[PDB]
Amino acid sequence: KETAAAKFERQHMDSSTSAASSSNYCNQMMKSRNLTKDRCKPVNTFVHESLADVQAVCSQKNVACKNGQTNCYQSYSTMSITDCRETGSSKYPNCAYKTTQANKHIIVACEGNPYVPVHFDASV
Secondary structure (H helix, E strand, O other): OOOOOHHHHHEEEOOOOOOOOOOOOHHHHHHHOOOOOOOOOEEEEEOOOOOOHHHHHOOEEEEEOOOOOOEEEEOOEEEEEEEEEEOOOOOOOOOOEEEEEEOEEEEEEOOOOOEEEEEEEOOO
């Protein structure tokens, strides 16, 4: 039902805010995007750029993926992102996260026709 593209959007896109809304941001967003439903997803990145700008990365710098696949792409520009990292005292179902804002190049894995982001690999 949920496409790979739509799952990427749910897990990783947050164009509404320019930068990590608050110290609370990861706590709210990890829950609301349903990344704390089955377990506390330990780490997750949200990108604060337009969908079109993130989709365009699939046409940008081709780099090896962490898993050894070849279909990863690094943004030529830096992008506004928020890293969410589960605290050492977070216990499901009260998943707690540290919120960190950064401006970094993103690396995404792309697939399909159309060729679109399906996985967030890294920021550098």
